[PDB]
Each structure stands twice: as structure tokens, then as C-alpha cells.
Design a protein around this ligand. Structure first.
Ligand code: BTM
Ligand code: PI
Ligand code: MG
Ligand code: MG
Ligand code: MG
Length: 340
């Protein structure tokens, strides 16, 4: 029962949700990883980890992924949620120095994860572990692309630190550009490829239909998160949210802003449906009677399929995850699962 202001009938009707068969073991294994990597307090893992639905989110996304690939992705993704929490806490505590140091360590670990597997900062060591494993699936050219994209993500998180420390709410267009980095659009897009077991040639993944399908999948996800995470974000003095940018700089009321975000979210869906058709047509063109062509076709098809799955996985994640249930918290400004 999704609340009216959050409900999207098109997703519920035309985007049936999927579940990777490895999910039952995935949920257990990632939880054990969080504990052993000491990324969250043991009591908070016990009480909140399963209810956070982080593994569910990934298992509803990267369908067809080899089990060990899904495991590395799930561990990374859970880590990223914890990083977002650490980032938030450093901000509210004014820990500029601690953040700067972490920021610098993540950059270095990104290029040389093996060196950071046992760093004193458990967050850094956990990052390096998931990254080292992700670097073991595809050629070095894919690893370099992943690294390049993530360096940009880290710097986007630093810009967020800058903004919140100074009390700046980004303009609408400024936010939209920034959001493609803080949501890590291109990381999720990169991870499509190890999931289907094929590093795509540039001419394939930069095909206008593949590019646009990939973009719309991520825009929907980020903006829908903005819609659903808005209550807890307002309560927690978060400034990064399309709704917040609209209220601040466009003189919109909360109701009007929510409506504007909804419309932009809804447009992603129908625009995706159009481009999805073009992307699948491209997939057909790739199937040229050669083994290589069959391979590229199957990969693009699997990838576009997962771009579609992201819609439904993200939609239901926000309904199920304990991460956004601010009304159930003792202190609305302080989520119970974060280390304060
Ligand atoms: C902060 C959480 N996350 C993923 C770890 C960072 C990019 C974005 C996200 C939120 C909600 C659903 C999906 C992704
Ligand atoms: O980053 P990119 O390679 O363009 O995707
Ligand atoms: Mg964030
Ligand atoms: Mg956040
Ligand atoms: Mg959010």
C-alpha cells in the first residue's frame, strides 16, 4: 500500500518486480560482511540490517548476475549506504578534517585497493575489499572506467560537504547535474557489464539509445529517492533534494514541489519506454549471425532489461526499507541505524 503522493500506477502495472535466485543467501552473506568488516555496530546490524533491504535492492536490479558478482555488488552497495551515513555524520558534527582524510583515502584506495584492505578506518578497509573484488571480473579497461567514475563521485560528495557546511542549497540545474554524481548514476551503469559478463565496446555502450536508456533509469531512481527521502531529509537538515531546490529557489510550496518532482519522475518512465524500444532494436541489429554479435546482443538486452528492473526495485525498496521510515523514529533528525 504505497501512499498516494508516492504511488506510481505505471510502475506497479507495467514494471513487474524481479528477484535474483541468490537473494536468500545474499541477504545473509552481506549481513555477515557488514559485521565482520565492522561497518556497523553489531547491535544495529542485528536490529536494522535486514530491515534496511539493501540486498533486496540489488537482487531486484542485477538479474542474471553470477552469484559472486552479485555478492560483490551487494557488499559494495551496502558499503555505499554506510558511507552516505558517515558522510552525513561528519557534516552534522563539523568534522571537516576527518572527512577530508576519508575523502583522500577513498581516492587512493580506488586506484590501489589491495594496499587498503586492513586500514584502521573500517570504512576504508571495507571499501577496498568490495572494490578489489569488483576489479576481478572484467579487463583492466573496465576497472579504469569504474575508477574514473568513482573519483568523480567522491568529489561530488565533497561538494555536498561544502554546500551543507556553508548552508547552500544548490540551484535546480546545479542540483540536477550534481545528482548524477552523488546518486552514482555511472557506477550502477558500469556494474551492468560484469553482471552480464561482458565489457561493452564504447561504440555499443555510447549508442544514443543505450546512453539515454541508462540515463533515464538513473534519473528516475535518483528523483524518486528524492521524492521518498524528502521527509527524513528535511528532518535531518539535508539540503540535496530536487524538492528542496525547488522550494528554496523557485518559491514553490511543499505540495507544489512534490507535484513537480512527481511529474519529472513520471516523465522518465514514459521516455524510458520509448528509448527502451530503440535500445532493443539496436540489440537486434547487433545479432548479425556471428558469435560476437550474438554475445553483444545478449549483453545489451540483459543490460537494458536491468535498467528496466531498476525502476521496480527502487520503487518497492523505498516502500519496504527501514531507511526512510522517519515517522517510526524516536528522533526524526537522527535515524536509528546511523552511528552518531
Ligand atoms: C545513499 C544511497 N545510494 C546508494 C548507496 C547512494 C548512491 C543511493 C540510492 C538510494 C536509494 C535507492 C537506490 C540508491
Ligand atoms: O564516462 P563515459 O566513458 O563517457 O561513459
Ligand atoms: Mg547522499
Ligand atoms: Mg543520504
Ligand atoms: Mg535521498
Amino acid at each position: 500500500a504505497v501512499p498516494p503522493s508516492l504511488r506510481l500506477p505505471v510502475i506497479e502495472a507495467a514494471f513487474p518486480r524481479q528477484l535474483h535466485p541468490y537473494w536468500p543467501k545474499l541477504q545473509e552473506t552481506t549481513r555477515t560482511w557488514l559485521l565482520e568488516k565492522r561497518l556497523m555496530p553489531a547491535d544495529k546490524v542485528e536490529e536494522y540490517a535486514d530491515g534496511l533491504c539493501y540486498t533486496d535492492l540489488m537482487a531486484g536490479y542485477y538479474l542474471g548476475a553470477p552469484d559472486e558478482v552479485l555478492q560483490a555488488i551487494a557488499d559494495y552497495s551496502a558499503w555505499h549506504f554506510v558511507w552516505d551515513d558517515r558522510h552525513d555524520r561528519d557534516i552534522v558534527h563539523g568534522r571537516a578534517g576527518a572527512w577530508r582524510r576519508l575523502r583522500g583515502l577513498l581516492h587512493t584506495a580506488l586506484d590501489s585497493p589491495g594496499d587498503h584492505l586492513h586500514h584502521e578506518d573500517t570504512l576504508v578497509a571495507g571499501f577496498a575489499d568490495s572494490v578489489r573484488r569488483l576489479y576481478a571480473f572484467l579487463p583492466a579497461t573496465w576497472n579504469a572506467r569504474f575508477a574514473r567514475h568513482f573519483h568523480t563521485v567522491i568529489e561530488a560528495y565533497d561538494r555536498e560537504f561544502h554546500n551543507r557546511t556553508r548552508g547552500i542549497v544548490p540551484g535546480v540545474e546545479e542540483y540536477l547535474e550534481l545528482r548524477r554524481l552523488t546518486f552514482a548514476h555511472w557506477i550502477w551503469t558500469d556494474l551492468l557489464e560484469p553482471s552480464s559478463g561482458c565489457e561493452l565496446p564504447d561504440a555499443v555502450r555510447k549508442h544514443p539509445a543505450y546512453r539515454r536508456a541508462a540515463l533515464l533509469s538513473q534519473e528516475f531512481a535518483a528523483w524518486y529517492n528524492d521524492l521518498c527521502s524528502l521527509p527524513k531529509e528535511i528532518a535531518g537538515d539535508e539540503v540535496h533534494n530536487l524538492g528542496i531546490s525547488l522550494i528554496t529557489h523557485h518559491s514553490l510550496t511543499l505540495e507544489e514541489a512534490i507535484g513537480e518532482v512527481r511529474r519529472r519522475v513520471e516523465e522518465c518512465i514514459t521516455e524510458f519506454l520509448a528509448v527502451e524500444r530503440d535500445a532493443l532494436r539496436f540489440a537486434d541489429e547487433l545479432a548479425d549471425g556471428t558469435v560476437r554479435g550474438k554475445e553483444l546482443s545478449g549483453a545489451v538486452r540483459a543490460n537494458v532489461g536491468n535498467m528496466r528492473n531498476w525502476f521496480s526495485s527502487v520503487y518497492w525498496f523505498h516502500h519496504e526499507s527501514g531507511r526512510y521510515m522517519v515517522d517510526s523514529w524516536d528522533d526524526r533528525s537522527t535515524p536509528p541505524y546511523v552511528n552518531n
